[PDB]
Scaffold this active site. Structure first.
Site, PDB file in Angstrom:
ATOM      1  CG  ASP A  69       8.747  -9.202  -1.900  1.00  0.00           C
ATOM      2  OD1 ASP A  69       8.968 -10.392  -2.226  1.00  0.00           O
ATOM      3  OD2 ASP A  69       7.956  -9.050  -1.344  1.00  0.00           O
TER       4      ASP A  69
ATOM      5  N   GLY B   9       0.912  -1.116  -0.307  1.00  0.00           N
ATOM      6  CA  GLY B   9      -0.329   0.507   0.021  1.00  0.00           C
ATOM      7  C   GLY B   9       0.921   1.118  -0.314  1.00  0.00           C
TER       8      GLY B   9
ATOM      9  CE  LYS C 268       3.801  -0.438   2.559  1.00  0.00           C
ATOM     10  NZ  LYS C 268       3.825   0.085   0.934  1.00  0.00           N
TER      11      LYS C 268
ATOM     12  CD  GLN D 147      13.771   0.123  -5.165  1.00  0.00           C
ATOM     13  OE1 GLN D 147      14.787  -0.234  -4.778  1.00  0.00           O
ATOM     14  NE2 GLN D 147      13.258   0.248  -6.510  1.00  0.00           N
TER      15      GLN D 147
END
Length: 294
Positions: free
Chosen positions: A123, A16, A33, A127
């Site tokens: 993942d 999100g 978040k 970033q």
């Protein structure tokens, strides 16, 4: 939520939107978040609640978990810059080796901690690596992929990053291990050194083939059981491996040997974070401070 005042959107991902916000009460500045029909599964709640207990200097701390109006909001400690932006800013001169070494060493400590608790990121990407003025770097979003699950896309119309995905995931293994994070970190290590992504695929097959063209097409000799993997195809082209000296120049031999162990095809041969911390490459590791322009 009411207790929080949004300051600016700082992220857009699968889980999100991410906003920099101020806690109306504590007055603290945090990363918020809001997480992306039913109303949040119980399994997800318990899993995230456990992750909240994980404390390590190299892991972005999950401060609070707010389940309200059948919605889920995660409150994380705030850091001003991510590694992706830091590398772009250093693209002209490059990041000094001592700083690269310090960051890698710290990231491995973070993985070692998480992995010892059987928690994985899955993942990893520049970033979600956050840095501060003191020279520290922290891993963000550990355990969230498993806590929530891997969706197909995002709401901002974006997709996860295939560039750092381990070969066993690409080949359809559904029970992959902590070794996938080591692979991702190796890819990131190479990127910091060369100032260019190692395997920037434009699709799953292109990702796999870029890996094959550099490390050589895997076979039963280097990776037992590889030809029996779900998405393995006997028709894959057969490419020969390249020397790391051409892949990550001018990294010294210690760095190249460590990188090689982090990029082993066989997950069971791939070095663990714990063992990597003892590699000779870290004999002279220090903690420099970056030139951070906020």
């Amino acid at each position: 939520m009411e207790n929080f005042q949004k300051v600016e959107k700082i992220g857009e991902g699968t889980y999100g939107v991410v906003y920099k916000a101020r806690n109306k009460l504590t007055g603290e500045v945090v990363a918020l978040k809001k997480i992306r029909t039913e109303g949040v599964p119980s399994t997800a709640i318990r899993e995230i609640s456990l992750l909240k207990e994980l404390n390590h200097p190299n892991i972005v701390k999950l401060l609070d978990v707010i389940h309200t109006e059948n919605k889920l909001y995660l409150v994380f400690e705030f850091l001003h810059q991510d590694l992706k932006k830091f590398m772009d800013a250093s693209a002209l001169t490059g990041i000094p080796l001592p700083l690269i070494k310090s960051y890698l060493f710290q990231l491995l400590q973070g993985l070692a901690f998480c992995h010892s608790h059987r928690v994985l990121h899955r993942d990893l990407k520049p970033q979600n690596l956050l840095i501060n003025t003191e020279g520290a770097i922290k891993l963000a979003d550990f355990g969230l992929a498993r806590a929530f699950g891997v969706p197909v896309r995002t709401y901002t119309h974006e997709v996860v990053t295939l560039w750092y995905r381990a070969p066993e995931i690409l080949l359809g293994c559904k029970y992959y291990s902590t070794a996938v994070d080591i692979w991702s970190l190796g890819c990131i290590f190479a990127e910091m050194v060369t100032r260019r992504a190692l395997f920037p695929g434009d699709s799953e097959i292109d990702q796999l083939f870029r890996i094959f063209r550099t490390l050589g097409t895997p076979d039963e000799v280097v990776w037992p059981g590889v030809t029996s993997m779900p998405d393995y195809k006997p028709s894959f082209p057969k490419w020969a491996r390249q020397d790391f000296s051409k892949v990550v120049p001018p990294l010294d031999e210690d760095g190249r040997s460590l990188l090689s162990q982090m990029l082993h095809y066989d997950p069971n041969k791939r070095i663990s974070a714990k063992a990597a911390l003892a590699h000779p490459f870290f004999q002279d590791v220090t903690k420099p401070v970056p030139h951070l322009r906020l």
